Write a protein that binds this ligand. Structure first.
Ligand SMILES: Nc1nc2c(ncn2[C@@H]2O[C@H](COP(=O)(O)OP(=O)(O)O)[C@@H](O)[C@H]2O)c(=O)[nH]1
Length: 168
């Protein structure tokens, strides 16, 4: 993507969060194509810091060990974008996604952040619609951050450029 190259050459800070198995790594791979590449969590956290040109991506699983949440606070200041990846077939765990999202948003350090929600795995038959996910997440209630929900399939990259377009 020319749009990805443009975005990353600019000076952005971006958080990508979601439960394990949401599709975070796959989404990033569709753009990164092994260039920059795969790096272990910063000591004392579960947070992967990946630098793409002038852009810093911070990636982590939410919904695991509760004591991990404190490790994230240092990372919040100056974040331009929060990318929330939601597995659209995981009806059973959407409640944890909701809980952690609103926990994260409560931080004054994230007041500047715009939130892109990727409704991922939209290829799967019988998945929740983006509208249902938006309803459950009560996104219409977020008035203090810009937000957008984007249906996607991380495997084919379908929807990913449109999500990125909303960001840029
Ligand atoms: N059917 C389907 N599977 C996906 C999609 N995106 C990711 N997966 C699969 O779900 C699993 C977890 O994806 P991964 O990127 O590792 O998620 P992460 O834990 O959030 O980093 C992998 O086996 C992926 O191949 C999707 O859009 N559709």
């Amino acid at each position: 993507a020319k749009l990805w190259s443009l975005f990353c050459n600019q000076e952005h800070k971006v958080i990508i969060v979601g439960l394990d198995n949401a599709g975070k790594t796959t989404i990033l791979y569709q753009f990164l194509m092994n260039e920059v590449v795969h790096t272990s969590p910063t000591i004392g956290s579960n947070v992967e810091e990946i630098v793409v040109k002038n852009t810093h991506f911070l990636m982590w699983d939410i919904g695991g060990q509760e004591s991990l949440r404190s490790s994230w606070n240092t990372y919040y200041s100056n974040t331009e974008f929060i990318i929330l990846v939601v597995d659209s077939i995981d009806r059973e765990r959407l409640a944890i996604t909701k809980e952690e999202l609103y926990r994260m948003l409560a931080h004054e350090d994230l007041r500047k952040a715009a939130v892109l929600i990727f409704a991922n795995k939209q290829d799967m038959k019988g998945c929740m619609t983006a509208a249902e996910i938006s309803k459950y997440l009560t996104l219409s209630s977020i008035k203090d951050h810009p937000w957008h929900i984007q249906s996607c399939c991380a495997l084919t990259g379908e929807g990913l450029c449109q999500g990125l377009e909303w960001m840029t």
